[PDB]
Amino acid sequence: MSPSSLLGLLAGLQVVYFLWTKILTIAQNLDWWWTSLSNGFRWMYLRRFIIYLLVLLLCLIFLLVLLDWKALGNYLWEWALARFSWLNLLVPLLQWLGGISLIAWFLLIWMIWFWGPALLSILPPFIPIFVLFFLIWVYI
Amino acid sequence: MSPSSLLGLLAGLQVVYFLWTKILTIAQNLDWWWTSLNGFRWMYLRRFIIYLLVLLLCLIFLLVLLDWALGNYLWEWALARFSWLNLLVPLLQWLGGISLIAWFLLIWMIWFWGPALLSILPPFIPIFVLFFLIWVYI
């Protein structure tokens, strides 16, 4: 048997472990990089494997999201029967998120970016302001 | 609106607090996750990634509610890709038959041994592969 079967199987395996060690080395760096921003080795593999699962899921999801845009709104309209008071507040926002949309993409994303550090710093005083806003929403 | 509904709302106020702190707990879990397996600048971004994972996770859980139909619907469209996979699902079903408890047995032993085996595995692969190849050389 061996000459055909071995030749075909070894060629396929050879590529696969080369890609797998490439995939591992992609992940090895990636995983480091994320933590770098800041049973353990079995966890380091398992964490990566979980990351590969997230990547797998994200590939499927990324494809699914592309392919609807290429059904979400209609499923969101079933949720709109539950949501409808909060969805009436979303209807004006969907007038800004379409309306100002091109302008807001450039302008707002930069303005808010340094506002992102401002949000982190403001968040703690904003929690009492959000409680005040909630008391106003209960009042009127 | 009754005082008993207010006592339930107060448990909801610990749910608010529990939600905020739940974000930070995820980070804490991860921190040993890495260490087993200025700081705003990194910490902040890392909690955003947690947010994205939480959202994603919720979307995945919601897809499981749509399912438990969705699985079959996609799995049918995937047949458009399946060459081997049609034959391979039954093969995985050979272990599938070793089902209710015995899947869990397989998983549990695979973890429990698995680290030791994974060290052993490159040492073991030469003799292991040699043995199967010898059974084909026979």
Q: Are B27 and B50 in contact (CB under 8 A)?
A: yes
The burial class, CB within 10 Å (0-12 / 13-18 / 19+), for A44 is: buried
What residues of B are in contact with residue A58 (Cβ under 8 Å)? 56
For B20, name the nearest residue in chain A, comparing CA atoms only.
A127
- H or E segment to which residue A131 belongs: helix A101-139
Resolution reading in Å? 6.5
Å from B55 to nearest chain A CA?
12
For A31, name the nearest residue in chain B, comparing CA atoms only.
B34
What tokens does A140 get?
């009127």
* Single-letter amino acid, residue B129: V
* Single-letter amino acid, residue A11: A
- Residue of B1, B34, B75 to mutate for A, most A C-beta atoms under 10 A: B34
Distance CA B138, CA B132 (A): 10
Distance CA B36, CA A43 (A): 7
For B137, name the nearest residue in chain A, comparing CA atoms only.
A2
Distance CA A39, CA A41 (A): 5
Å from A88 to nearest chain B CA?
23
Closest by CA to A51, choosing from A71, A31, A23, A79, is A31
Distance CA B16, CA A136 (A): 19
What tokens does B129 get?
């592969």
B37 in contact with chain A, both atoms CB, cutoff 8 A: yes
Question: Which residues 55-114 in chain B show a CB within 8 A of chain A?
Answer: 56, 59-60, 114
B87 CB-near residues (< 8 Å, 6+ apart) = none
A57 CB-near residues (< 8 Å, 6+ apart) = B56, B60
What residues of A are in contact with residue B53 (Cβ under 8 Å)? 54
A42 in contact with chain B, both atoms CB, cutoff 8 A: yes
Neighbours of B17 (CB within 10 A): 10
HSE on the CB side for B106, CA within 13 Å?
Answer: 11
Experimental technique behind these coordinates: cryo-EM
The CA–CA distances, whole Å, from B46 to B21, B27, B40, B51 equal 15, 8, 9, 9
Distance CA B57, CA B63 (A): 10
- Determine the angle formed by the axes of helices B3-36 and A40-69, rounding to 10 degrees: 120
B115 in contact with chain A, both atoms CB, cutoff 8 A: yes
Residue listed under structure tokens 């409680």: A131
Distance CA A101, CA A94 (A): 10
What tokens does A110 get?
């930069």
